Amino acid sequence: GKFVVVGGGIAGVTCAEQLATHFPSEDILLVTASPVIKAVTNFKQISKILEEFDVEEQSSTMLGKRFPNIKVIESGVKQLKSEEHCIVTEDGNQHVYKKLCLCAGAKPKLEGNPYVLGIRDTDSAQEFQKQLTKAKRIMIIGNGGIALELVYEIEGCEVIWAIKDKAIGNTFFDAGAAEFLTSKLSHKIHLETMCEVKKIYLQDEFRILKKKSFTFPRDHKSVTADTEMWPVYVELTNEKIYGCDFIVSATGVTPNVEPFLHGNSFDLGEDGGLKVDDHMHTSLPDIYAAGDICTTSWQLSPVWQQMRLWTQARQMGWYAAKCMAAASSGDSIDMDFSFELFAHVTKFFNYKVVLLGKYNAQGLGSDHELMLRCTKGREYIKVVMQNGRMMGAVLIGETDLEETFENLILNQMNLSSYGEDLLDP
Ligand SMILES: Cc1cc2nc3c(=O)[nH]c(=O)nc-3n(C[C@H](O)[C@H](O)[C@H](O)COP(=O)(O)OP(=O)(O)OC[C@H]3O[C@@H](n4cnc5c(N)ncnc54)[C@H](O)[C@@H]3O)c2cc1C
């Protein structure tokens, strides 16, 4: 059997390229479910942990031109017979493997189909907003990715933002940092909290049903009914019903583990992903996983956590490919240092954003010290500590605590002496 890699995603492509670079004479199969292959472009090394790049899209032949021993099968996997050491794909064909790597990623949660618009990791705020110019009122559900940036961006019309959370903020920023970012930002923006889409109607069904619809809330005096018609109507969790021109969906996402589960006995993580050890090896023999589809299930570092990220996906695919290569060669790679410190770098509202470690005190509940310095429109420096040792940080705006904070979190020394010194060079 060949080396088989499933998923034309970041982790799958990274794994396939590394496998080709490890076994040039062998053929490495890359099973994909789309004619698009996401490639990493303009890799930037910033430190031993910090890394930045962007994501372009190639065809299959573009990859084949630089990697000839990678043969791509454009037919998504529909079944995995792990006992019989093979996979069956949509065309009806079978392919045996000596070592398999699963990188199918994670699928969304999917009812007003013409007017509900999905978002993906290739969308930008301006590019997406370009189509929403001639629209009177937009409902955005969830905080996924561009959602935050989009809510406070569109100046044209009314935004209604329905979230499961209590206050504003996506997975990156708590309510404080979200408030800091949008300080410079008229926009009719109303926030519905602790709710999700209970039901959706198109006005053809709704007018037959003949139920109410509310106005955009101005004051605390009362809630009245709408007057103008709307293409779509949303009945939210808290029985509130709103008319709407277009609906942006930024809902959650679950690992795309469905095709590979029947007939097998995978050990799943709590979130539904495939559990992987420190070698990206899953519960089943000769099967590895990386990307959004897996669950890091070793004794993880206290300043690291897994997240949906291009950076983590690339790193996981790379380590998985190297582990598969070393296992086939019997080199017995014993690297236990693999993932040391969580880090992420972005620019949201023209602000340089750097997140390190337990940047929101994830997991370390109630028994954590928090320090903060701020300058409105200029700087945000949040610091999370425990037992004198630094556990995470958020640096928004052009600070220069990035390198030093990385070093401090990695060292984890009992810095019980310094007080507010840590917030200024
Ligand atoms: C709206 C949104 C915005 C995001 N923004 C960012 C961002 O700004 N930065 C960031 O770092 N991360 C972002 N992410 C995270 C995103 O999920 C990353 O791309 C992810 O971390 C990388 O996933 P992956 O390596 O598992 O591969 P994926 O990108 O998930 O790709 C997996 C591949 O497998 C293929 N596949 C699926 N099923 C099968 C099958 N049965 N057989 C064969 N192939 C199959 C898919 O077609 C796909 O090509 C965002 C996610 C979402 C949803």
Curated annotation (Swiss-Prot):
Signal peptide: none
Enzyme class: oxidoreductase
Organism superkingdom: Eukaryota
Disulfide bond residue pairs: none
Transmembrane segments: none
Keyword annotations of the record: Acetylation, Cytoplasm, Disease variant, FAD, Flavoprotein, Limb-girdle muscular dystrophy, Myofibrillar myopathy, NADP, Nucleus, Oxidoreductase
GO-annotated cellular components: nucleus; sarcomere
Key word Nucleus present: yes
EC number: 1.8.1.-
A Gene Ontology BP annotation from the UniProt entry: cellular response to oxidative stress
Cofactor(s) needed for function: FAD
Subcellular location: Nucleus; Cytoplasm; Cytoplasm, Myofibril, Sarcomere
Cytoplasm in keyword set: yes
GO molecular function terms noted in the UniProt entry: NAD(P)H oxidase H2O2-forming activity
Family as reported in the entry's similarity comment: Belongs to the class-I pyridine nucleotide-disulfide oxidoreductase family. PYROXD1 subfamily.
Disease: Myopathy, myofibrillar, 8: A form of myofibrillar myopathy, a group of chronic neuromuscular disorders characterized at ultrastructural level by disintegration of the sarcomeric Z disk and myofibrils, and replacement of the normal myofibrillar markings by small dense granules, or larger hyaline masses, or amorphous material. MFM8 is an autosomal recessive form, clinically characterized by slowly progressive symmetrical weakness affecting both proximal and distal muscles, with normal to moderately elevated creatine kinase. A mutation in PYROXD1 is the cause of autosomal recessive limb-girdle muscular dystrophy. The affected individual with a homozygous recessive PYROXD1 mutation showed progressive muscle weakness with an onset at the age of 9 years. Initial symptoms included excessive falling while running, with slowly progressive weakness. Difficulty navigating stairs by the age if 18, and loss of ambulation at the age of 37 years. Neurological examination showed proximal symmetrical muscle weakness and wasting, along with calf muscle pseudohypertrophy.
PANTHER family, A to Z: PYRIDINE NUCLEOTIDE-DISULFIDE OXIDOREDUCTASE DOMAIN-CONTAINING (PTHR43429), PYRIDINE NUCLEOTIDE-DISULFIDE OXIDOREDUCTASE DOMAIN-CONTAINING PROTEIN 1 (PTHR43429:SF2)
Protein name according to UniProt: Pyridine nucleotide-disulfide oxidoreductase domain-containing protein 1
Gene of this entry: PYROXD1
